[PDB]
Enzyme design. Structure first.
Site, PDB file in Angstrom:
ATOM      1  N   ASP A  20       0.056  -7.646   1.556  1.00 21.24           N
ATOM      2  CA  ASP A  20       0.761  -6.344   1.214  1.00 21.24           C
ATOM      3  C   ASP A  20       1.991  -5.886   1.030  1.00 21.24           C
ATOM      4  OD1 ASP A  20       0.611  -3.554   1.540  1.00 21.24           O
ATOM      5  OD2 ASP A  20      -0.357  -3.616   3.781  1.00 21.24           O
ATOM      6  N   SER A  79       2.636  -4.039   7.813  1.00 20.48           N
ATOM      7  CA  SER A  79       1.443  -3.812   6.688  1.00 20.48           C
ATOM      8  C   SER A  79       0.338  -2.489   7.456  1.00 20.48           C
ATOM      9  CB  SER A  79       0.016  -4.618   7.267  1.00 20.48           C
ATOM     10  OG  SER A  79      -1.173  -4.621   6.221  1.00 20.48           O
ATOM     11  N   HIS A 104       0.466  -1.183  -0.230  1.00 17.67           N
ATOM     12  CA  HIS A 104       0.135  -0.305   0.076  1.00 17.67           C
ATOM     13  C   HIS A 104       0.684   1.405   0.038  1.00 17.67           C
ATOM     14  CE1 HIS A 104       0.233   0.011   4.061  1.00 17.67           C
ATOM     15  NE2 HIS A 104       0.370   1.310   4.291  1.00 17.67           N
ATOM     16  N   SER A 139       4.133   1.580   8.490  1.00 19.20           N
ATOM     17  CA  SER A 139       4.066   0.847   6.753  1.00 19.20           C
ATOM     18  C   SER A 139       5.238   0.509   7.068  1.00 19.20           C
ATOM     19  CB  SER A 139       2.969   1.222   6.206  1.00 19.20           C
ATOM     20  OG  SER A 139       1.740   1.371   6.537  1.00 19.20           O
ATOM     21  N   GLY A 186       2.442   6.303   9.384  1.00 24.99           N
ATOM     22  CA  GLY A 186       3.902   5.641   8.746  1.00 24.99           C
ATOM     23  C   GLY A 186       4.789   4.804   8.957  1.00 24.99           C
TER      24      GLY A 186
END
Lengths: 198, 4
Positions: free
Chosen positions: A63, A159, A36, A143, A141
């Site tokens: 993801d 994720s 993502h 991720s 942030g």
């Protein structure tokens, strides 16, 4: 730029994410992150300088992504922990109950334990299945950032999770936190990548 | 859950 797990990178001069792990694909250098975070060909920047572009990604469903970097980047087998580093030694997957830590540009380095595997996250864009759940806290942030054991075994990339109004789940008790990561194993095999280790 |  020196590529270390946990540091910030921006995508198309907009969104921020964190580096997961340094990897190679033949002679090509790269890092794995969260799907993502960008679309194929989005531009990755570290400290205002272009370092590479998204080579592939899968999101939602899974993801995951890898960014291929220019030749000038320096891949390191390390994950940031404040001012110090955690050396990457491999990718043995830990079991439910094992302690684990994660590093990201938002909350820094946080540790907790794995509480469940094969979890489904129902994101607004669609479901993301097969995620592992830990109770280390994390924020927006974080991720794509690294999930690793203190011993150096790389577990996955961040994720998402249940965020509060402050942008993280650090203000809620461990018992109620749901911080999810995408397992690293399937990303290495899917893209034919090898982890950089030390 | 939200992404992140």
């Amino acid at each position: 730029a020196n590529i270390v797990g946990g540091i910030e990178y921006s995508i198309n001069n907009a969104s921020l994410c964190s580096v997961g792990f340094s990897v190679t694909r033949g002679a090509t250098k790269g890092f794995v992150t969260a799907g993502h975070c960008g679309t194929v060909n989005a531009t990755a920047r570290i400290g205002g300088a272009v370092v590479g572009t998204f080579a592939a990604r899968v999101f939602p469903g899974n993801d995951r992504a890898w960014v291929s970097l220019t030749s000038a980047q320096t891949l390191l087998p390390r994950v940031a922990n404040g001012s110090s580093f955690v050396t990457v030694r491999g990718s043995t997957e830990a079991a439910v109950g094992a302690a684990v830590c994660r590093s990201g540009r938002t909350t820094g380095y946080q540790c907790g334990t794995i509480t469940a595997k094969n979890v489904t996250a129902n994101y607004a864009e669609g479901a993301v299945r097969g995620l592992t759940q830990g109770n280390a806290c994390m924020g927006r942030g974080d991720s794509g950032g690294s999930w690793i054991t203190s011993a150096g075994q790389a577990q996955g990339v961040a994720s998402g999770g249940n965020v509060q109004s402050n942008g993280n789940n650090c203000g809620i008790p461990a018992s109620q936190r749901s911080s999810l990561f995408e397992r690293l194993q399937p990303i290495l095999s899917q893209y034919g990548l090898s982890l950089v280790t030390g | 859950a939200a992404p992140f």
